[PDB]
Unconditional design. Sequence first.
Lengths: 314, 314, 314
Amino acid sequence: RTIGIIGAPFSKGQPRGGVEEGPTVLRKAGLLEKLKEQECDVKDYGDLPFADIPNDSPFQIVKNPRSVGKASEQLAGKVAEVKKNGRISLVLGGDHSLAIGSISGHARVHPDLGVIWVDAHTDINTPLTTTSGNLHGQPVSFLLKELKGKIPDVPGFSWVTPCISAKDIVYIGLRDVDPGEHYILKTLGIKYFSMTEVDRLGIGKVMEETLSYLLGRKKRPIHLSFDVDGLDPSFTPATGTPVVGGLTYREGLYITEEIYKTGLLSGLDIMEVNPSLGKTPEEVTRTVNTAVAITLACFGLAREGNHKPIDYLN
Amino acid sequence: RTIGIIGAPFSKGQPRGGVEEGPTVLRKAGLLEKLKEQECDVKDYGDLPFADIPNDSPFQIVKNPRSVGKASEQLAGKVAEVKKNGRISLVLGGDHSLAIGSISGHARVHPDLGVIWVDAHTDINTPLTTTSGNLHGQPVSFLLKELKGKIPDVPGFSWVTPCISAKDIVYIGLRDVDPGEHYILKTLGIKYFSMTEVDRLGIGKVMEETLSYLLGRKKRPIHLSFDVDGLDPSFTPATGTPVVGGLTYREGLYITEEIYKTGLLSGLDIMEVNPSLGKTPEEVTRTVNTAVAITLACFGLAREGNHKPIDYLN
Amino acid sequence: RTIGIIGAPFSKGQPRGGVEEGPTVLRKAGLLEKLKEQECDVKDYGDLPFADIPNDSPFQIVKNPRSVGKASEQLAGKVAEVKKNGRISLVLGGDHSLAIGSISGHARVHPDLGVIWVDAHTDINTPLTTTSGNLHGQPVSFLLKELKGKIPDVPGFSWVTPCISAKDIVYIGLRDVDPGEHYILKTLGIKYFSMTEVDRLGIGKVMEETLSYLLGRKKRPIHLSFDVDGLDPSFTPATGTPVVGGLTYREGLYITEEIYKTGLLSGLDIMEVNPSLGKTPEEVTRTVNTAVAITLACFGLAREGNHKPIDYLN
Ligand SMILES: N[C@@H](CCCC[B-](O)(O)O)C(=O)O
Ligand SMILES: N[C@@H](CCCC[B-](O)(O)O)C(=O)O
Ligand SMILES: N[C@@H](CCCC[B-](O)(O)O)C(=O)O
Ligand SMILES: [Co+2]
Ligand SMILES: [Co+2]
Ligand SMILES: [Co+2]
Ligand SMILES: [Co+2]
Ligand SMILES: [Co+2]
Ligand SMILES: [Co+2]
């Protein structure tokens, strides 16, 4: 599998700025090295340099819209470039708002992509439904074609064009969804597997249906947006919006192992890892370690084992 | 959903007296407020004042029988009253012995009720089978019609009349059952799902069968007696009789979310929460928080989300 | 059920010597007493005294081959003796290398035995595939008939005769398998349920298939080799090779409860418990406690309860 690593040290989609350290701690944990330890072809396109936009007052309640909108616009470009290089874009980012540019850039090359959004949240608040104003909780609303007409023209996002339909996305792990967000869920008929469905069906059936749902009619490129708060904070504590009762370490690896096995993974986001929020140096390493393990699984690392195409017994 | 809150600060069903603080810490955690934050109609009937019965020597091995028997008799009355007010009785109690009065009072109004008992124990010891003498581990024996004839006339329980049949109760979560208790299980043919069955079937199937079992022939009012030690102590540590290998936070919420969805919940007990037993201030908050989350789920709070009947996108 | 307890304080199959304390801490936790508390017939054949083999240089990369080979040869003899006494051999050991002698001795009496290997590892490295040289990670390679011809004549194992076929063994819990080990897995067609399969099917189906797999054609004696690192280190931290994402306390007990229920358990190993590796006195007790609970389950202790064949209500 050939990857296109892209560091995205951004945080203006939410209050806490430690998420910008994401690319740093992840790379320093040997991610690139570990990918190469596998049969992975890796090209690191570096960390995107997000220049400061000192003048960026709120748009109504929406915070740092110009900074956010510009970082996603830039990202979208780098992603598109890697997708043109015939590589799977791996976005080691800051907050989840970056998803807007990652998915957008991906769709430019493969407009028929299907999205898997693992998160404890749906992040589909509109600028009028969000109560926090944090954009890392509204990325999905900017992308849905069905929602084009409700989203106001927010400074910094003029370049955006909704690229995915409500039927081309599956949510897995939900356990903290706002009222307006849930209204949108049921109204647009979005397919989701909240923690209740996971508990009911088991992660195997959940993944079986998710993949059947998105790859029913035909095979299409898959984009996986992975918010680390989708996993229980007993696994990923150094994250800004933890919610108890999350997916287990195992369920996290099962999800990714199944996605990889599709052979259709083409876009991947690893978001919301914030070292600064770790209560102890071990919570940080535990969060980073869990984050790396999930990434390796997306590119082939299997729990049952791996082996090159040779005769080990000779 | 309309609730009838009833505080039951009682502890004489067992040794440790910190359980009496149950109503206090639960209410102070905003339970009433959080219920109102939902579409819940709440009337708090206050904390029942249990006067001291200084003269209450053991009956054979059975401890504090008069104190226990009187608190359940009183409770039964308050429950019946709330059930007559057309409200779902919510009993924030002390020890599980109170179940005797809660279920009894409930049955007075709805004699056809079905019982779901979530606990790590079966609490069906008779005064002759119990080895500890603690009544919080014998409540079920006073209620079963099938057992009427074996239970001795214990001071304080003359007012009791067995109200439920062995076939109108399901156990979920069992992992610490005494020999005589197990003998009673198999002999009366009581339906139960111990941790082994949960592991075997999954919580979804367990709940599917539990509800099919109790609501097969017809729909009937449901009484949920929830002992917090049914959940693993990694979730509810501040409890008197913890047993490892318990139901998860998720399984706990799944159970309740499914019960609520029946629309038949009419009686609820939240028992054995003892702040005094928390090893740290966080074990207390973790136990209380888990206790509140389970209660909210019984009245509609869903992990996938909630929304009023309006147009959020306008 | 009648047991034949055998202490095996050995550690030369790996670096750390604290595993030799296994028999000691296990017995001192009341294991023999607790077995008797059940309807178990127990005869403790004592702790095998492994004399020092001061002169034992590496064989290529393989470490302490003579010490290891001799301890398994001795063990095999004691096991065979207990199996001749019509008792179920219970091997409280040190490292997993001892499996070589336990299974070998067992097969002498019941050559048709079936093996269940619960571990986070496959321990099927050959002296030429192992990279660590630690024999506790190669035991399975000495036993497989299919592998006879690749394994070099290692000092200390001249007495060995491969006793099991690749089709008479099931692995459960795998999550850290070496490349050569995985090559062997797929090539010999060994049946296994890694953590991925557990996640996919559930432990109930996994056990259903494992037992159907080994007891399909006919009923045969079952040998359970239980490496405590098969369970998540949140349960068994005092172990030499911990790997996160392991089987839960519940899954561990479910496995054993199901094996016991077969009535065919005839050989049992409880390996890799190392007190010296516990970060705190509680990690040690937690590891030992978990180890005892699993053993009791193999001999009848059920979570739903137990009761003698009498009338408890009289
Ligand atoms: N729904 C909340 C929290 C969303 C959290 C964003 B996320 O999932 O990216 O961490 C909000 O709108 O602020
Ligand atoms: N079976 C034990 C323990 C029962 C625990 C009571 B419970 O479930 O309410 O906490 C006894 O009879 O003392
Ligand atoms: N595969 C590694 C680790 C095996 C661990 C051995 B065991 O499972 O017994 O703990 C090795 O060969 O050194
Ligand atoms: Co999130
Ligand atoms: Co998110
Ligand atoms: Co209990
Ligand atoms: Co109870
Ligand atoms: Co192992
Ligand atoms: Co092993």
